[PDB]
């Protein structure tokens, strides 16, 4: 029994932890594994939904009331002119991507993705028979897209340009210029922009801008959800919406609807929790952002005062992506294993985020300053020796 | 101009207009018990809420919580006598996701999957979505919709990658006997292909007991799928699981592919897995009270349908569907019949040809509503039938 | 910075000619069975066509002709197609083109918006693919069945047709398979076209190049459906280098009036096809077809011979071609991972050049194409080396 | 069944001829329709090629011996440093253009063309999804390009500047000053010049200068053929070559080659005739130019002695482009039809050559003086009366 070709093409610390060694894990982008939880009013709504009997299959498009709530939130934030019929509730951004790529992709079709890349995008495009094509982002510009690289990498087989902003793994925040220019290129070639907006409100200085706000003709597919901004990773709930005044995506939307129907629906009670998060008080976020900004400032400061390491200052999300300027290691994979075994600190090897990630590593600044301080002291010691 | 995926566009799957005009319609078309007088049991609800309050709101292992995988192992030993380990078990976002993972990991373009006829539509669309060909094997109404073994023998080709068994069955309510299951295993063994067993309706039986092919296999690798949607009345929780009866690891590459796919999609819902632990390890008392109401509703609709001239049906042995035959009438097909019943009798059925060619000349109805609603629906339908 | 669409234009069939030139540089002689050009072998356009060509030049017929083609040529086509195909057309239904190649550029150019589909056979003829894609169209390949000597799979056409399909291309007789389509498939293709209200495009360049069976044009068979027929001098008249052909419309209700007007505008900006060659064309079309009898005898013996030699080699099986001058054998067993690898190894060792089957799309994978254009003497030499190579492998 | 968008965008005397009225046709630029034929040695090579069996498909690049002959001829006339590999044989200048526009144009890309314009440029740029942008040429300067207008009209979407020299419809001959200034602009904006040189040797006073001779850095694509200078319009044969020391066209050449391969090849025997024309005696041309100059001088003299009409003296090709100074007509179209119905003389209306051609007409001076005399006598009489 041989597995499918498509499925096969889809691409240590436990041995330490089983001995009783505590490794500082800076590899995991899940805020809920640290001092973060979904706000009380979201927990209450979820639990009230269950008890009140909202345990049935919902409409495949998602609950009308949640779709209404998404409209108002996106109008307030992004000024986009959308209706509930422009919105689809999904099982997180993960399922958004699945539906979108499933509906867009024929064999050998291409999607432009940033490099350094977010690995689930690469696996998903490959699985749906497509070819993911990394466009360059520039470290010296705090990981802004290289628009000439986007221009060069477009072929007539390109079915979309994906924008992940704010960015994982770099923490970049794309400005109006970058976005306007990506939209112009996409408009020339008559293709949609997919905008991953999960880290939305998770910015440190200066607001996020959605390409949905800026487009005139170019259709944008915006994806968002509760995982990061609402600290509800294990609840698997999200959405997508279309900014498409000229109705250029009507065939694609119809394809998305067929795929959504056959899969039945996302979680029902979680969608009451989502209504609560979207229409509720944002005080919880103010407080989390404060401590997260402190943690950003701290790890940035610590990493830059270590000789042989440099890094940008992340403007969004909760990742920092340092460069290993000098050292004995053949590659970043070997480097990360060195730090694991000898400093008991776990990063992610940069090259796991594609070719533009090589010679880098990714760290999360989700742990409290005390944990970061210990991590950075050890890592500073490790680097001085090497 | 922006073209959709050829294969997405190929995924196939009015009463609302009547209700707009103030006309009240009885819906016998939706297989969702929670839309009626059925709820997930209290100890599962409490566990779900408790997981949330207690902070279990993070991404879990992509394979599923180790506690849930252990609870599944024990539950399947209890019911099916199978010896499996937690590492043979994968938690999924319902059976829907299980099917996506299995077909996604198994199918190359043009590979075949033998599925029952009448068919359950998700199987068809998913198999076609991955470039596969769904090949329908006959089931025999005269025999209460048991598989036609001879027909499975003839429909099998060198391109066939699995035989799907949906038992108890949607849309017919059939419960397959040891003989049919034993014979499907002999065929799968002969051609060296796995069996996929959909056991979502498991414990939802009236007379007779459900037997898993997993219990019966010797050499044949069996992939079993189940979950919370039906037996636990938690359709909206989107939680299920699959496991492998495969001591020789014949499906090792397939299993390895499933794991890669499971990894990229992160994990299914976290808190719902605690509710799952409470349902799997808990007593099944809640279900006894529910099966009583369902059996009397089964008995009632079956009686009512058979005493209507021009309509006949088998007696469902599992699930909550009945699949009657339209013997005589003016309609050109079962679609026309179902729209006509809707317009006039204000009862909503699903047309049999929606379940592929073996469902033609039939309609599916759920007997999920209380007797008072079923009585109302059957009175109007009977009047309608007299008239035509 | 070049056009994205121009840079994506593929032509894998020729993506094998470079390795062969390298061997010849080393003084190693190669037998070329990869090029469908009869004039490279012992075939020439008949004497009466040559003479008319030369006569046209000397008599001063060296100006721009009307963009639709010379009226005398359009009239000769009308009568020729009446005789062969029983079809009823006037000179205004005919357009002279710079070969079939240009007919295809005009038709696809005039018919296809980006995102439109065209149903084309698989294995496919590469220009169809390349031209459809250049215009933003999707070439959707329908199955043809080796077991039935490469006749269209009608069920597959029913499965692959959509509301976005603008036409069904029929290449008959067929390149690369040599298939000749029966009245059954032709009739059922017209039935599908009629149901979706789309035209049939019929490539009939190998028209009269048949061994047994009759070529039947879908133009002959149609009731309600518009048929665009393409033909020319290149193959049946052995004038590949003259670059002359034509198209015509079997469309009495003018369902294609808009498409036809568009073709005429495109024809107008390009000025015209070659003038003197059109007098040669008239000599071919109005003349006796005796010249073809002698050539067909040679081609039938070469067809018979290579089919015979190919099938007596273990690891190789093939259908018997009913038209054109190609054979498309299956590579049943061997060490190779794909047909490209197979084709290069044959070239290197047996010093015989085939075209890899996957250069004709996915339905061609595990196969290769050969021409039986060379004399028996050369084919014997070629098949001996290839048989030694296969035995060795 | 609808025709394509691109093919949609592509934009009388017979009724008189049917009565038996002989209109004098001064509207068609085909010299073979008058007292002109390709020289005998060209005819003989064509006919010999057919007899000797050169009737197969040639290489898509053209015959190596023809490419070698183009090289010698262009080295001798223009002093350019090219090899056979910088040369592509085409099905006339028309196919040169199709190949060059196909290979260059993404949707919305612009090509600068002269105004008054040669219409096929407009049609072909539009067909390939481009936008043709006319730059002004100046009547008082004998229709030399307006270099300020070129500077003004160029944008970041400009892909090439086309130069039609000697010019149709005006008969202008561009000089070194014009050419150097067009090259400077092209160099500044990093774009090639396309040079249409089909009327090359068809000059009356002073020699044609090719921008290929003048360039240092700027890539030039030169187009030429047998149609005009060798009076073989019906043979559909020509060529293009590249003057590009810095190899700035490497991608465009790849694209041209991809397009050339799939159309197979140009006519084979014509290429033997082309070798005979390019390397054979030019005696035939001396005699033809003599007669053409006499006809140029004649029509120029006649048109300038008709009150209400003015025109420049054409320095090249065989067209004259007179201004309709005064008269009752609303436009040049009305005028041309009036001249047809009442003088039985057929011109082309100037606005057929874009906006800068409004209020002009185009006449050919290919016919012998007796015919020109008769046409002018009728036209003089037509004008006096109106
Ligand atoms: C780039 C990016 N997109 C999307 C997500 C959110 O994923 P999900 O909604 O499936 O939990 C995360 C993780 C992320 O880092
Ligand atoms: C036969 C059958 N299989 C599978 C399912 C899908 O169930 P779910 O995705 O809710 O687990 C259903 C409902 C069903 O009726
Ligand atoms: C199937 C087929 N059609 C048409 C032609 C194109 O030939 P030409 O452009 O020389 O007329 C060929 C080669 C071919 O084999
Ligand atoms: C200026 C100019 N260039 C080129 C051509 C196109 O000529 P051909 O395709 O016959 O070479 C014409 C006619 C024209 O007048």
Features of the shown structure:
386 residues, pyridoxal phosphate binding (chain B), binds pyridoxal-5'-phosphate, alpha/beta, 14 helices, Aspartate Aminotransferase, domain 2, 8-stranded mixed beta sheet, Ala_Aminotransferase (chain B), 2 domains, Aspartate Aminotransferase, domain 1, homotetramer, globular, 15 strands, PyrdxlP-dep_Trfase_small (chain B), pyridoxal phosphate (chain B)
What does this 3D model show about the protein?
Chain B: It holds the Pfam family Aminotran_1_2. The structure is a homotetramer. Chain A is of the alpha/beta class and 386 residues long. Helices cover 40% and strands 15% of the residues of chain A. Chain A is built from 14 helices and 15 strands. Chain A has helices at 5-8, 14-17, 40-51, 64-78, 92-104, 119-127, 147-153, 176-188, 211-214, 250-262, 270-279, 283-304, 332-343, 369-385; strands at 24-25, 87-90, 110-115, 131-138, 144-145, 158-164, 193-196, 220-225, 238-243, 309-310, 319-320, 323-324, 345-346, 348-349, 361-364. In chain A, helix 5 (92-104) crosses helix 10. Chains in contact: A-B, A-C, A-D, B-C, C-D. Chains A and B meet through helix 1, helix 3, helix 5, helix 6 and helix 10 of A and helix 1, helix 3, helix 5, helix 6 and helix 10 of B. The structure holds pyridoxal-5'-phosphate (PLP) (4 copies).
